[PDB]
Structure formats: C-alpha cells, structure tokens
Amino acid sequence: QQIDALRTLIRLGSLHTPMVVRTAATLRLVDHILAGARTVKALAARTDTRPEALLRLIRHLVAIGLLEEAPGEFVPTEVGELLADDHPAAQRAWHDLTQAVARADISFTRLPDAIRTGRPTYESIYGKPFYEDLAGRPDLRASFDSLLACDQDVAFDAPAAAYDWTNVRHVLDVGGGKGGFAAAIARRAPHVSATVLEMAGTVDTARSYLKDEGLSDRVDVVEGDFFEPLPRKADAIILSFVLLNWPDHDAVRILTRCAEALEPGGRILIHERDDLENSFNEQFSTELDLRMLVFLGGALRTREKWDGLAASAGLVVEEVRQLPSPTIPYDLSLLVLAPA
Amino acid sequence: RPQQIDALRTLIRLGSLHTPMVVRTAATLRLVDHILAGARTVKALAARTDTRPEALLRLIRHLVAIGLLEEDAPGEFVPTEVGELLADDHPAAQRAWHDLTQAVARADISFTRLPDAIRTGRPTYESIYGKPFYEDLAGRPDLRASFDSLLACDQDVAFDAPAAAYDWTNVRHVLDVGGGKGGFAAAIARRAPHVSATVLEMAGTVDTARSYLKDEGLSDRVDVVEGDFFEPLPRKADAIILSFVLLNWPDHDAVRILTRCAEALEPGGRILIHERDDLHENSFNEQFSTELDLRMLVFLGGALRTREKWDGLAASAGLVVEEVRQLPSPTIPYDLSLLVLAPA
C-alpha cells in the first residue's frame, strides 16, 4: 500500500506533467501531427524546436497517454485529440502559454505568498495587475475574450431561459465580454433591447460579434468602467462571471453601482457558482477559486456569503436557479437580487 | 459521450498546474507535520504556518479534494494514507523533495519555461534565478545544504547494492568524483575493510561529507578534497566512481569528466558509473525516467542516456563499457544500474 501511496503522491506533486501538456498545446503539436507531420524532423520544423529535445517531450506525452508511437511516427490518442485546435471544448487554447489564462496560471508558482498574504501574485510576475496587464497587451486582451467566449453561442441559452423577460424592456450586461449573454436574451425575447458595458479592446470584438449575429439594431456596446456610474438604467442588470474576479469590498462597489442603475421593479442577475457538487465538480471549483485568488484576489462564494454581499449593497437574494452547462459538465447558478 | 466526458476529465487533470503547486505549498508550509503535532483547526494551523486563515482553508479544500487530507471532525483536518508521506520523518523524504524553499522544488520552477528549453535545448534555470544551477548553489549556503541533504536522504542504504555489485578484492584506493556526502564511499568502506577512499566535491558540500564520514567512524579511511572535476584529479585510483554526476552534463562536458577520470586510473583500474541505463518502458518506471530526464534538461542541459549513447560517450573518452548491472532501489521503486568502463 505504501508503494501505491508513494506513486500517487509523486504524480499529484509533479510540475513536469502539466507543463509538458501546456508545452504541447503551445507548440500546436497535435494539430501538426493531424496535418501530416508524423515524423520527428518534420514536427520539429513546424514547431520550430530542436528535434532531440522535442523527442524528450514526446516521450512523456506517450507516458501519460496523450500520444502513441510506426517507429518515429506519433499519433494522438482520444485524450490527445482534445488538443486539436478545432475541438469544441477549446482545451488547446486554454492550455496555450501564449494566451491569457495559461499565461496567468504561472501565478501559481508563488502560491505560498498568496496563502500567506491573501493577495494575488500575478502582478509580482507580470508587472501589472491582471486587467491592467491585458489593457496594455492587445494580443492577451483578445485571447482572454476568445477563451471565455469559446462557447458563447450555447453557453448562455440556459440562463437566458431561466428568467422571465415579459416585463423587461432593457438589459444592461455589466462586464458582458463579447456580448454572448446579451445575444442569447435578444434571441429569446425579441422585444428586449440591451447594452453591453465593457473595457477597451473588448468593446470592438463585442460590436463585431453582435453585428455578425444580425443584432446590431438591438444591442449597444459601451466602453466604460463599472466602478463608475453606469451608462444608463435598466430593468435587468446582468453580472456574468464578474463578481468572482473581485474581493468583497470591490464586489460590493460593483453591486452598489448596479442597484443605483436599476429601474423600479428591476432585478440584478448574477450568473456564477452558488458554491457547494460531486467529486468531479469539486475539482473545477477548487481550481477556479484558487485561480481567482492568485490572479485577482477574488473568490467563489457560498450562499451565506452572497447573502451578506447582497445586504451590504442594500439588496436581497430573491431566488436561485441551478443550471446545467453544455460543453463541460459543471453546475452553474443564476441568482436573482432585488432591493432590500 | 461518456467516453468524451472521460477524456476531457483526464486531459484537464493532466494539464492542471494548481494541483502540484498546492501539494508543494502544503509541503513547504509543513502542513502535515503541524497537524500531526496537534493543530487540527484552521486557526491553530494558520498560526503555526504564519498564513491567512481564509486562504489556508481554500488551500485545504483542494488538499481534501485530491485525497491528501480529510475532515474527520468539523473544522478538523487529518492526513490520509497518502497525506502521511508529507510528514517530515517519512523515509521517502517527499516533504523535503516538494519544499519550495529547498533546492530541487525551487529548481522545478524552471519547468514554467519548458517551451524555451524545447526550442533551444538549453536550460532555463539561469533565466529565472540569475545563475546556472551549481553556481547559484555555490552562492546560497542554505540551498547548497538542502540539495546535498535531498540527494543523500537515504544514503545509509542507497549505496549498499551498487557497492556489492563490484568486486573489491583487488582495489586499494577508490576515488568518488562528485561524491555528495560520501555515502557511496562509506558503503564500500563498510563492505571492504582493506579499501581506502577519497571524495572529491565542491565547497560547502565538503564540510558535510567530512562530518558525515567522521560520524560513521570512517575518518581514518576516507578523506575529502575540495576541487573541480574538470581540472586534473587530485590523485590516481583503482576504481573511480561517478554516481549521478554525468546525467547533469551535456555530452561535451560529460566527455571531459570521463577524460579526467581515465587519466587518473591506475593500471587495471575501472570507472564505475551509477545511474540509469535508460530504456523506454511501460511500468511506472517511465514517468520517473521522463521527469528526471526533463529535469536535467531544464536545470542543467543534462540528460539520461541509453546504452548506445553510453557507448559513444565512452569511445570519445577512450573507454569501453565492459559490463552493466541492474540494481534494486531500497526507497523509491525505480531500477538503476552500475556501468563498469575500461580503457579501450
């Protein structure tokens, strides 16, 4: 039993395996193989790497079962195929060290400082805090928006169906990304108009995305800062995966700006985790919660915490709806908040 | 569609950087030792590790999720069978090997730049810590000492089998080049009372070899010399040992080291290499092999070598591989080998 406990511990503690996975995604190793380069010299050329070092990386990729080896010819496994760039779960991009998230994940190398201080480590590594770093790096800004929106044609169908749009005229989507939630509601409730509030760079991609859905006459995009007064009032105000980016004091500020922008009868809709789930759900949550810590100083929140957050902003949680996810099996929640 | 959820889970697990950093953080904070020393509540534990209670609880939740800790009473956390291996006195020493303040786990941060190493073939350690590996240790006595203690963590038994894998009947003197704390020299000395030995090592390490050999009662049979194995060796020997030295070096340096050794061999002398006669395997052997080979890459620009590579290295130094013995390990289930080289 000790040999077994020992193998398990060494596996769990190993840094080399996820960096090998991320290296392979970054070099688009699987895409090139699927595009014919099954040999070492050809793969090394396409990835622009040394053939002997590439071979040493490939060896571990075989050991963990992402690839398998005719002699000197390698093919992806079923698991390996998920690193193809056109796979629906987009795992290649999520593991790509040149794109925003896997890049930010380096913050985990300073996890002890984060546990010691409760403060994010991203800045100590990259020179500026997360959104400020992206603000100065249009490549990262763009890749971040594409990752979060990787699923946007379907990801917002369930939450949009979980709210009654009958007496809503206007929706404001605060930090709404490329506008996917706004678009989903528009398709569902054609009498509804919307505004998306977003940061520089992102607003241009939102405008394009919405124009390409044919929604340009129904959803506006405004460039702004949701710590400042909101650009207009609305019957529903949406915060989809925004509040987990912020520590309690900032999250209360954001909620306060939303409450002040609400029309009479209006509601604020928080789309996130109502944090609790099973053994596979639990590791998504622990990973996302710790990401928020090291990237941003944010956190996932239980219902008891939402209740306190709501009250501090003069709000109350009116109801909570649990929602299935379509591309990755994870349970999400829509919280509906009303003035207290 | 169950097989697709299956594959997606596997990939996400294999790709995850947070899990090994959480394991390393637990080891560095000595979390499991404090728990075993009485601190089961978060408040108590946060105090002993000098961390913030709410953030520690978030770390602990992943530690429970991956099966390193369990909550037996509310707010009370205890280690599982797997978590117990992080107690500081467990024989495999995995706490220390995962401690981010100690040399190896600290060095493992070099993997965050693995793409550079695959592109260039060069180590990334220096780009991160400002100096190459052995120079960085030369300037940081704390890191030098923890490195030596990691490599020697089972030295009492780690060298018994290689020492018995060679006949000492006609050996008078042994030189152990880069011999660490002297453990190999000591195993041979216990096995063959007629043999005397010299350990050649770097600054800092020589003090702890000297103390270790003294404390084995071997002071009058094994001495220690501070020196550089790229320079002429301090004396001639019948057997010269390179134990986990050559894998730290690229071929051109490995050939220089072997050449210094060949020049210092008495007539009929042999060079003994203790390392891996590497081969592609199926068992869990393969993930130890790949981790070690890739560490040597990103830390040092070194590598594990197959028999064919060993043959080439030896010929370049005017040597030939005469025999290879497979060796059982006593602590970690990983087969090693002893290569015996002679003048070509």
Ligand SMILES: CC[C@@]1(O)C[C@H](O[C@H]2C[C@H](N(C)C)[C@H](O)[C@H](C)O2)c2c(cc3c(c2O)C(=O)c2c(O)cccc2C3=O)[C@H]1C(=O)OC
């Ligand atoms: C892989 C699961 C999930 O996609 C859930 C979750 O992603 C879900 C919902 C997400 N959302 C836009 C609806 C999208 O549909 C995605 C494909 O699936 C999630 C993830 C990751 C992030 C985030 C996630 O929300 C973030 O929000 C996030 C952020 O807001 C700022 C910085 C970084 C991140 C994230 O890294 C993912 C996660 O939990 O990984 C452990």
Ligand SMILES: CC[C@@]1(O)C[C@H](O[C@H]2C[C@H](N(C)C)[C@H](O)[C@H](C)O2)c2c(cc3c(c2O)C(=O)c2c(O)cccc2C3=O)[C@H]1C(=O)OC
């Ligand atoms: C965990 C297995 C092993 O202990 C084998 C291997 O450790 C073996 C042999 C080692 N040796 C002194 C005989 C000792 O008995 C240890 C407990 O078990 C090994 C390990 C690691 C290193 C090294 C290893 O040799 C190094 O040599 C090394 C180095 O020379 C310079 C920098 C770093 C390292 C290492 O990180 C380990 C390894 O392969 O991890 C994947």
Ligand SMILES: Nc1ncnc2c1ncn2[C@@H]1O[C@H](CSCC[C@H](N)C(=O)O)[C@@H](O)[C@H]1O
């Ligand atoms: N001060 C600020 N003002 C406006 N938007 C901000 C902001 N700080 C961060 N954001 C935006 O908040 C978003 C969080 S992630 C976007 C989530 C999106 N609602 C979705 O569910 O897909 C990012 O797009 C980021 O650009």
Ligand SMILES: Nc1ncnc2c1ncn2[C@@H]1O[C@H](CSCC[C@H](N)C(=O)O)[C@@H](O)[C@H]1O
């Ligand atoms: N130029 C040099 N001269 C002498 N020793 C060196 C050296 N460069 C590295 N070393 C030593 O080589 C060793 C590699 S690890 C030592 C392993 C030890 N022989 C064992 O089997 O446990 C380190 O102790 C390091 O101090």
